[PDB]
Enzyme design. Sequence first.
Site, PDB file in Angstrom:
ATOM      1  N   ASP A 104      41.201 -14.464  -1.907  1.00 26.17           N
ATOM      2  CA  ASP A 104      40.906 -13.066  -1.452  1.00 26.17           C
ATOM      3  C   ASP A 104      40.904 -12.983   0.082  1.00 26.17           C
ATOM      4  O   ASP A 104      39.912 -13.401   0.670  1.00 26.17           O
ATOM      5  CB  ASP A 104      39.529 -12.618  -1.956  1.00 26.17           C
ATOM      6  CG  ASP A 104      39.066 -11.240  -1.515  1.00 26.17           C
ATOM      7  OD1 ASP A 104      39.909 -10.469  -1.045  1.00 26.17           O
ATOM      8  OD2 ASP A 104      37.870 -10.931  -1.704  1.00 26.17           O
ATOM      9  N   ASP A 111      45.287  -7.427   1.406  1.00 24.03           N
ATOM     10  CA  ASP A 111      44.140  -7.899   0.574  1.00 24.03           C
ATOM     11  C   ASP A 111      44.671  -8.578  -0.701  1.00 24.03           C
ATOM     12  O   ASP A 111      44.725  -7.899  -1.768  1.00 24.03           O
ATOM     13  CB  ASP A 111      43.239  -6.700   0.253  1.00 24.03           C
ATOM     14  CG  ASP A 111      42.013  -7.018  -0.576  1.00 24.03           C
ATOM     15  OD1 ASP A 111      41.834  -8.222  -0.867  1.00 24.03           O
ATOM     16  OD2 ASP A 111      41.232  -6.054  -0.906  1.00 24.03           O
TER      17      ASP A 111
END
Length: 340
Positions: free
Chosen positions: A38, A226
């Site tokens: 992430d 992201d």
Amino acid sequence: LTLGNTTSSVILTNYMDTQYYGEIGIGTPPQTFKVVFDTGSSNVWVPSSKCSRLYTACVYHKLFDASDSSSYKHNGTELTLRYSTGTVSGFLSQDIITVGGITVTQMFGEVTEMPALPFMLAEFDGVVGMGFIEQAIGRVTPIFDNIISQGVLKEDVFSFYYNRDSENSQSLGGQIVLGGSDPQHYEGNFHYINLIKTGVWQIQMKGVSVGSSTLLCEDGCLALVDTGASYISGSTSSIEKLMEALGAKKRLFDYVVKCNEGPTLPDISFHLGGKEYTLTSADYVFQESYSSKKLCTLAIHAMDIPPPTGPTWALGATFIRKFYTEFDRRNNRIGFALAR
Ligand SMILES: *[C@@H]1O[C@H](CO)[C@@H](O)[C@H](O)[C@H]1NC(C)=O
């Protein structure tokens, strides 16, 4: 900064085009966890043995047990980690973590509070934040800083490939390269965009076009890149307008269109740096049917990211599927190339 001559790859599993996770090991002997890598966060956590079985999430995930690790080091500092879709709570621990070929001493969260919604819907156990120390909760060194410290990685970069889902079991769900790119998964040349700042994988975005007309982020806006977002996300106002342009009804958690209308839905482009990055309807529709009677989700939704990072666009897996992405910590910029 010290550079060696090691490239290290992490094979990733693609669940239903929405969850991309790989395997890490923690402790001696190793306990293995499925983790989302992430770029929108900077901590490591996995669920803990110390999580009450009253959290049904902890019944249905791998639990780190420090009492079975001879390399565990106690800390016990509390911490809460807030994510786009849900929140977890626990305490800090140290152990050896194996990711690709690489072994590092890493501080990480043992989670003891793991809400049923949404962690019951997670194929993955935990998270490896690939973001910057500036975002780390409890100001913990993120795993990538720690690997860079070891002076083995050929370059201070990491790259993401996110495949399309496949029925075929022998299909590669995804690939993280630590210290490089894999030219087997992109083509043409990287095109780079420098970050607003160091400490967040966010870049200036100039425009979003829906087919012909730039009817969104007309002045200029923020794009968080992201690898931990399933979708491309804007702010409730950006989307409920985007979708009005597409002709999409708004459900509770996503936008849908009548499946029959899906394939002719217009192109969506993203002005990032020099180049204009275009997605076809194939690229942003879950075309699970062609029936007017049935409804088809879009891979773009409302995400109100709070400041100081937000409000922003999030460019997640819907986008990285088409664009092989190279995170360059050396020169604080993101490279994009056409994926293959
Ligand atoms: C936890 O680790 C931090 C950061 O490395 C350290 O400075 C702190 O004193 C530790 N606390 C305990 C109780 O071990």
